[PDB]
Amino acid sequence: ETKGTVLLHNAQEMLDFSKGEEKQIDAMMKEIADMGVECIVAGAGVGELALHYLNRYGILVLKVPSKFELRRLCRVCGATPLPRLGAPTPEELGLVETVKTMEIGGDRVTVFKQEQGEISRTSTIILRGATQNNLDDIERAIDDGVAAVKGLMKP
Amino acid sequence: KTSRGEIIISNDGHTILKQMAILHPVARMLVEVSAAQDSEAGDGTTSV
Amino acid sequence: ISPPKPDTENNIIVNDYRQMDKILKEERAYLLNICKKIKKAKCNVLLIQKSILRDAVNDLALHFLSKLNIMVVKDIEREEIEFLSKGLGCKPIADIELFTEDRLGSADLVEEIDSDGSKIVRVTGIRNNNARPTVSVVIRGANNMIIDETERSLHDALCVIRCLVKERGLIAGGGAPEIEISRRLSKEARSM
Amino acid sequence: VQIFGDQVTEERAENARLSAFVGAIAVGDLVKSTLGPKGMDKLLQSASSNTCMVTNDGATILKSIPLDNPAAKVLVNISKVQDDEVGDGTTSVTVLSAELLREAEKLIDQSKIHPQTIIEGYRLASAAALDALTKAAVDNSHDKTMFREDLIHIAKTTLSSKILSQDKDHFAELATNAILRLKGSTNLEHIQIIKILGGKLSDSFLDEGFILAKKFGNNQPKRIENAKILIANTTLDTDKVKIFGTKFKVDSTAKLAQLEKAEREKMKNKIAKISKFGINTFINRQLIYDYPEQLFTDLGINSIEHADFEGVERLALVTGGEVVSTFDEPSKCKLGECDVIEEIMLGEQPFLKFSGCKAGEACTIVLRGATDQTLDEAERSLHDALSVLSQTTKETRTVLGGGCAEMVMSKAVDTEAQNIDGKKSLAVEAFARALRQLPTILADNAGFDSSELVSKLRSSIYNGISTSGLDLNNGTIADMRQLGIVESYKLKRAVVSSASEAAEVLLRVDNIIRARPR
Amino acid sequence: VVFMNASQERTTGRQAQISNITAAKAVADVIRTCLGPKAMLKMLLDPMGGLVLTNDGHAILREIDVAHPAA
Amino acid sequence: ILIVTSNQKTTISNDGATILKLLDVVHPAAKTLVDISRAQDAEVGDGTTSVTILAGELMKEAKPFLEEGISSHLIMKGYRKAVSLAVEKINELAVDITSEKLERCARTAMSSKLIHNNADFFVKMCVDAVLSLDRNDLDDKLIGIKKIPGGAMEESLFINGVAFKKTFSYAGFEQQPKKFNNPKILSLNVELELKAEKDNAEVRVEHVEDYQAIVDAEWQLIFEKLRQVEETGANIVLSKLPIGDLATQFFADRNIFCAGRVSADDMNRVIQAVGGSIQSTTSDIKPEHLGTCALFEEMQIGSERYNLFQGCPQAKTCTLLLRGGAEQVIAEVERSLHDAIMIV
Amino acid sequence: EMGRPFIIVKDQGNKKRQHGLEAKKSHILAARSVASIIKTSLGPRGLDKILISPDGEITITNDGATILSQMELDNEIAKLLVQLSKSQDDEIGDGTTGVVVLASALLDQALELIQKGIHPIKIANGFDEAAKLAISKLEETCDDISASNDELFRDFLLRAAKTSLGSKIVSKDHDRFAEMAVEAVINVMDKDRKDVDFDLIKMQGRVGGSISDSKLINGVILDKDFSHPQMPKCVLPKEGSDGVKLAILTCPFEPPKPKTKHKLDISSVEEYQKLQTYEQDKFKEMIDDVKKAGADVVICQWGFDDEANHLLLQNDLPAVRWVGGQELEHIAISTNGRIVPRFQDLSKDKLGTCSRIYEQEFGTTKDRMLIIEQSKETKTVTCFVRGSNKMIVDEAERALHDSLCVVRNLVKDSRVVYGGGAAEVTMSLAVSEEADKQRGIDQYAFRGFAQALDTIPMTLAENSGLDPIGTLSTLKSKQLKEKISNIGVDCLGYGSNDMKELFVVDPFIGKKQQILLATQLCRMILKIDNVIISGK
């Protein structure tokens, strides 16, 4: 976090500096691939050197900006995030049967949809409409029905 | 009285013509005539 | 005269806290050894040209030459070095290793005259081998307009002798050459 | 429907053809009175700083005066090319190209001649004009005596149109010898021109050597005999080495004093290698500090600082030496030799004069004038004379001037006009009458007759005498071989070719489009 | 064109009924204190400068310039 | 309709979606026609003009009803009930058409727009364009088309792969052969040139003897990545990051093609065209990850040279090169082709 | 209005809308204003035009692509014709003035059909069908010249060269220009007479001298002179040699330094003295690698320090400084050399070979320029043009540039036509004949396309002062009596209207694009109805 700088005293350390960073990501991503992890959710920008070994084992890459967007992803699969890059705990790994990418409104969307077994929480409703103005109030109209469900709990 | 804050009182014919700007090109050459007399000789530059 | 400051950027790294004591001792020792060699040649007057980048004389070196009774003058124009070299017959010293007695000039009396709130340094007498002596004249006056004109009046006077030494011979002024040439030409103009 | 934007000036009709021809008339009439030795100089009023410039050359007059007419810009560009190529005749090209449009204006209006027909008429007319100059060219390069004498007569013709026409007899030898010193070199950047204000205009002289305005730094004597001159271009003042990533790591200032002292040791070791050559004089184009200059005092070597790089090439050719860096090897390095080096003073500024130099491949010209306007004119007057004499060493063919060369070309134009027939005969004969204007204007500036005097020169050539010419002093027909009026053959072809090509430009413009200024 | 040069924009419906009722109520509200034996007085200032001080209903209305058309 | 915006950008469009994008509509109710025009163009791509004409007519027929005593919700009951029976009627109009197994549908989509009279030609390229895309994928980028100003639109031809612009002139470019008999395309994310490596540059060298080894070490590391490419026999190298003249000249003596500056969208089409893969490092390059094709030839089109990828046995990339006199002509043709592909 | 402001689009009052017949009349008259400008410069009897730039620079040309490029317009219809000639110059490079006249001729005949009540699409549908009938008719009339050997093939290149050289300034030298333009392709070309590379020929202009000094020089012409000009200007090879061994280096001469920012710390005087010897050892090593390789002239991209001025002078090694990166590619092609990235990779096989390296004095001062010559046929041909005016040196570039565009089009196999208006007349009568067989509503469409093709021959008679009626009637009557299509308009008046005896030859690919660019552009213009133009 303070004054990150490359220090090379002699040409001997310079020759092994290029291959040194490649072995660091390889050693860290190997423990994840050995656990059978086919998808990794990232919360910030990922460097190109890290994305190379993820394509070697066929591991998907997801970008989750800000916070609340990533917080509701773990509630679906029942996973516990950890800051380290080491091998995650097998008990903290989530379960998603299928991940699909199809065209809906002209752009590529990722499908987190669950199935009958291994039920998930925080489901989403795809809302299709001709005008964006109708899409705004129907979103608030659905929230009125969601808020009505809260009235079935406290009393 | 120069355009700046400096003021020069001089009887020398070359210094008068040098600090006095002239709008006529042929009359501007009279300044260079006094310079030719002062550089080579240095005396009698107001007579030329 | 100052602590060493090469043109190339240098980085002084102090590893030990005891090294800071040796640094302050060597900085004053570097300026002391320069002043010790000046006293060996019995040079009581030092002239320093205008300084660029670092200062000409450090304040720490002022105490060295003051206790030894040595007059110091700095901020001298570079174009005036040629006049001071031939005027006083002193060969300039650009290096402390090349500093010697033979390269130093000589003066009978060096005094700074302070009068009417104005200070001026004058040298009385010149003793040396010189084939091109110099001269200096002090100009006074009421204001800068009169003083500048007093000098401009001297330029016209110095050019009179220059024309006589360069070209030997002179004529009579006051209207003599204007009327004589006009009369001699009028006689020859009728014959053409 | 207007497709063009706002503030767009365009003329699709007679107004365009009228503005193109009249636009060249004001340009031709401006430089008309500047043609010939009897011409008058022009005055230029600057829009800033109030700097007046008086020059007889038409190249500077057209470039300084702002001209928004595209028809005028065509005559300005051909004058800049004529100055940069041959170095003289910028006025003759502008006048001759303007007269071609004068004869072409009456053919389109009165004679109703097609524009391309006038252009195609000059094509066959220029072929006879260039072939007429080839048979009239004489090559004197077979004899060094006759070739050197011709260089004097050419200089008298160029210097006649300028303010030097009175003293041109004394200045013809100065310009002739200066080109002989180059030994065939056409580069004029090797000759230095130092302008000095005051004194008689005839006091201009040419010394053998290199006159440098710079002076020795401090203690170096003014006059010294048998001094070897050395030139070093690079560094030698507080050497920075090369890379900028070098630094001094200092634990205590005791070691810092030894690091800076080692820099002075590199200075003393480099100057010590210079003394191995046995030279009494050293010259650096870069300015020399006080420490390296004092090292030459005990060695008895002169020092010179702040020399310009364009003067180094001028200095290397006078001394006949070689620029020397990397002093480690004395063998492969060569030094210059000079008999005596004295520091003189011309005016208020002292100068460095050289004498008895081995190589004469370069020199320095000193001029004297009453005003700076005459100094700026004297430098441009010699720049036009030295440029023609420089190209003469390459192409040694010469053609008689003074109205002779223009009338000889018109003799072959009238012959080819009969075999063409058609309507091009009016265009071909228009080129012959356009060649009459150059000798006619020579008589107009002198107050002579523009008809009977020209007719005497025309009738004398058709009688079998090709050596007849125009004499402006006596106002009659005189022989050009006896008067010594001759110009280079390259100048004759350049004026005819540039004017013929420039005339084909504006005659091809039916429409003039002016975009909104920015 | 501009079509009608007089009030091309129009205020109709309940907006015009409220403006007529509200302005009519303001006429009676100022004279509420002018009724009864304990009623107060009202002073009016004309552009001529003459002062009229009375509790009469008509003298107050005719000397006040109302910009509202229906009022 | 000819529309000129405040930037003096000429655009000629009859499309209801494009016309409403040029103009800036500040009217609240008039912006609803813009949403339905962009929504119709996003999914189907055709009929954006018919939707706006139909949506505006429903408001025109409801205009005399609002002047009467008909309530606002009573009118919406008529449209919502009629559209329910109208959708079921379209299913009766349609036919399963499983018999006879793109040609007829692409000709009708080009109507009302340019090159419609040329449908005897451009439609043949529209059929094989979508067929290169496998089911469940149907990528919208792999059908991308490049626009070349100048020329005639009848000179266009079909290409089995993507063609991109060089955008940069290499000093060792001409020394590289422009005709390959069996090229091997290698996609690399490495940056080949002399520069600081990762995110920071500093060097501390105490001794002059070790100062020479630091320079030679930088040349060996850059050349080490160059030797590993030559040992694999890759004729074509593509990279997103810039490539200096040092790596380009090394590939010139080996007869290896080099390129850079290519956008990320173009190299995504290269992986699908030759069936290769993206390698972000030179140490992991393996022979089985390199793609190939039948031939490689660089042809100049409108003072612009492009790299032609064609002849691959299986390629999902379709890129066309369009020509036309006006800058809008080349825009209208792709606009017709982009709308015609979405129909098939 | 009802009393409330009605604004559909921002800047309501700023933008204007045109519709109906007035919108079509403004589009036709916009093309007629551009046509009458180009019709005056069409043909060898045409006239140039002055182009004034906002910066003060002027341009004199008859080229429809250059005139419209620097032309500042307002109406967008006239701006569509700008890219029309630009489309002709970029690809084919010939006939930029013909596409504007032919396109406006189609719009002039279309305006008469619109006033008669014909739908604009029906007009565009008739021009598309008539365009393919004219191309297919002219394709059958021409013959294949590829059966001739290389001796006769050079003659056909000289025929089409002199045609494109006309109509432009300095057309008197076209005899030598045609010879120099063909020899450039003879030297640079494929052995199979196909797909010649145009980029190997560079156009380098020079301002000075006269037009008669223009000659072909095979090599590289650089604006930089020899560094430290104490060396001889003209470099000569050794007595026996394989060549001059030209060296090209993209690396300046400096002691090796890391590309990254470095800090060299000198902690003692002994470490500083080693840097002194280490400094001079590198400049001595770099100059020895060139001498051991036999190279003579060294080319540096970034130049070198003044230390090497005398070092390279002792070994008699010419050197240049500050050479552009684009010029380095041009150098290695001429001498067939290879750029050497560093001295460690320097070998004798990577050195270029040229005949002679020398510089010319040109004018009085000007600047110093380097010239390279080749001893045999090479892949580099540099054009050398001189002139007495800056405008002549400029226009002569694009004049010979368009001349090279005609020769490279003849490299394509089995495409040739004869110019002089003989192509438009032949294709005009073929379209008018089909109009009688088809009849229907499109009968008037083929008539408008036939009358538009005849405008080009009639335009040639206007600049030559002839009668367009009497000239067109002779050409139409000749094609009906005899099948020879080689009869056309003669603007030079040499007689013999047969193009075979006059040698005038044009590329078919150039004339085919003129019909395609004109027909396909008018199809888009006639579809324009609502015109929305925002205020500037």
Author numbering:
A (entry chain Q): 260 to 414
B (entry chain D): 49 to 96
C (entry chain D): 241 to 432
D (entry chain B): 3 to 520
E (entry chain g): 5 to 75
F (entry chain H): 51 to 151, 158 to 400
G (entry chain E): 24 to 559
Q: Which of the paper's sentences describe this entry?
A:
The TRiC/CCT complex assists in the folding of approximately 10% of cytosolic proteins through an ATP-driven conformational cycle, playing a crucial role in maintaining protein homeostasis. TRiC is an ATP-dependent macromolecular machine that facilitates substrate binding and folding through ATP-driven conformational transitions. It consists of two identical stacked rings, each containing eight paralogous subunits (sharing ~25–40% sequence identity in the same organism) arranged in a specific order. An individual TRiC subunit comprises three domains: an equatorial domain (E domain) that contains the ATP-binding site and forms intra- and inter-ring contacts, an apical domain (A domain) that comprises the interaction sites with target proteins, and an intermediate domain (I domain) that connects the other two domains.
As a control experiment, we also determined the cryo-EM map of yeast TRiC in the presence of ATP-AlFx, a nucleotide analog that has been used to mimic the ATP-hydrolysis transition state and can trigger TRiC ring closure. The map was resolved at the resolution of 3.58 Å (termed TRiC-ATP-AlFx), exhibiting a both-ring tightly closed conformation of TRiC.
